[PDB]
Amino acid sequence: GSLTEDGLSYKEKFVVRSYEVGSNKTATVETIANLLQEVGCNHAQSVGFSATTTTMRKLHLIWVTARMHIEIYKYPAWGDVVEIETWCQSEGRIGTRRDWILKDSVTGEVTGRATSKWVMMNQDTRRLQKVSDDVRDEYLVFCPQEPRLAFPEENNRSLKKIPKLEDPAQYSMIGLKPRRADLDMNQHVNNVTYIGWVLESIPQEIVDTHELQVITLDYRRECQQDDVVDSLTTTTSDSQFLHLLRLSGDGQEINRGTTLWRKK
Amino acid sequence: GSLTEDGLSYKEKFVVRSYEVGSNKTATVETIANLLQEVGCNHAQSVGFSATTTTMRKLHLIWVTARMHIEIYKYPAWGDVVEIETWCQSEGRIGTRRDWILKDSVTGEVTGRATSKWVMMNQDTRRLQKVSDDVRDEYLVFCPQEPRLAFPEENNRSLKKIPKLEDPAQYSMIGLKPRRADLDMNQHVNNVTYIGWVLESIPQEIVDTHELQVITLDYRRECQQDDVVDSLTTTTSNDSQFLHLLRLSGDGQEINRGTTLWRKK
Ligand SMILES: COc1ccnc(N2CCNCC2)n1
Ligand SMILES: COc1ccnc(N2CCNCC2)n1
Secondary structure, X not given: XXXXXXXOOEEEEEEOOHHHEOOOOEEOHHHHHHHXXXXXXXXXXXXXXXOOOOHHHHHOEEEEEEEXXXXXXXXXXXXXXXXXXXXXXXXXXXXXXXXXXXXXXXXXXXXXXXXXXXXXXXXXXXXXXXXXXXXXXXXXXXXXXXXXXXXXXXXXHHHOOOOOOXXXXXXXXXXXXXXXXXXXXXXOEOHHHHHHHHHOOOOHHHHHHEEEEEEEEEEOOOOOOOOOEEEEEEEOOOEEEEEEEEEOOOOOEEEEEEEEEEEO | OEEOOOOOOEEEEEEOOHHHEOOOOEEOHHHHHHHHHHHHHHHHHHOOOOOOOHHHHHHOEEEEEEEEEEEEOOOOEOOOEEEEEEEEEEOOOOOEEEEEEXXXXXXXXXXXXXXXXXXXXXXXXOOEEOOOHHHHHHHHOOOOOOOOOOXXXXXXXXXXXXXXXXXXXXXXXXXXOOOHHHEOOOOOEOXXXXXXXXXXXXXXXXXXXXXXXXXXXXXXOOOOOOOOEEXXXXXXXXXXXXXXXXXXXXXXXXXEEEEEEEEEO
């Protein structure tokens, strides 16, 4: 992988692996989500990062994901090369936004796109902060200054409010626990695990006959290594679903989201 | 990746990914196990498979893993290039063997090695069988004819008998279930998931202070998408040795048995 000529975005090719594909012999949405995360880490490293930006390290500040939105048109097949282009942008003092475009390396056509909103947080108190200058000046040297949006459309799926699932849920997967493979190098549950846990309550009949076109996910609280999660789903309709991840015990909300599926 | 000059083995370089590493910023043993599986699939495809032969497809036969043995000296760090060389060999009518050598792409030194025994099974009845003559000739064209062993040694840990864990276990992880990411393209639980499930009963203190040097795993029965697994461990020992057992949560049916060896960091 490498930064583009202007140094304001980063590109990387990935060959789809055998264990990365599902029953259709195409990459799973979790494989896609891991590749977005990977190209994002390489972009951050190529422009001199740890995630932290020097002034975040002096203030014990970290970036946490608030939202993740992914729209796939075609899933790359096992053995295909997929090229992902990523870039960052400041959103005033709200937070930071990371966007991605996925292309077929052979045809050069867009096969998917993604967007994510990150909020500032103190890693000790776990308290959300607003982007207090300085960080915003150091982010301006690596970001495009004119807006560059993977989802430009006025009134689009990536910025819609997500409601809370009402009990009883139509479908459920109870007792989900993270194992060591679900943790990252800092022992926190990978943001991709939440996507997998959300999809666990989708019936196998929907998976076998439909393709996941869109997924939007809100992140409210992190799941601990020793926490148990319940995944809840309800059809709201193409097939549309409303999702909710909560702690098995007290019912504390950790995630909420929506998925859109089309018949194959 | 590509086959070697003689066409009797296959090589592939892999750059270690951010989500593939643990607390030490080095690849997990499950990442290593996925890369061995990946280079094995590419070797099989490069020599005209898809991993059944023509005779196996005609008879509804598949290869199932009976044993997986991995010995790591150095785990590649996040961002490093690792090169894996793999090859197959016929073991008469018993089954087949797949071997791997892992090297640091920069220094060219061996940083790990692995071996796996595969047995023939009818896809429908699930009954094991000895390799027929037609199958032995079909892969003798892709295998070295003189023995080539990743673990040559007189009495190596790769061929040792594994005993059955006695109740009560010292450590345990109960209620392990596979999710969709644990399934392969044919909807069967990935062999690497079993490794992860085995390691779930190892205490977090051992993981934090030791490095996994060796792991040997016996496969007896497959875990279904709707099956629940219990992982059991007992210390059998500066080095730490463990005895492991995976069994179905309900009836206590054995699915796996194994041993791990760890050294202090
Ligand atoms: C804004 O999204 C997120 C995501 C993950 N954790 C959190 N906080 C919320 C404040 N308490 C600590 C955890 N917020
Ligand atoms: C020897 O290795 C394995 C691995 C997985 N399943 C099996 N069988 C044994 C026979 N019954 C069906 C399952 N054997």
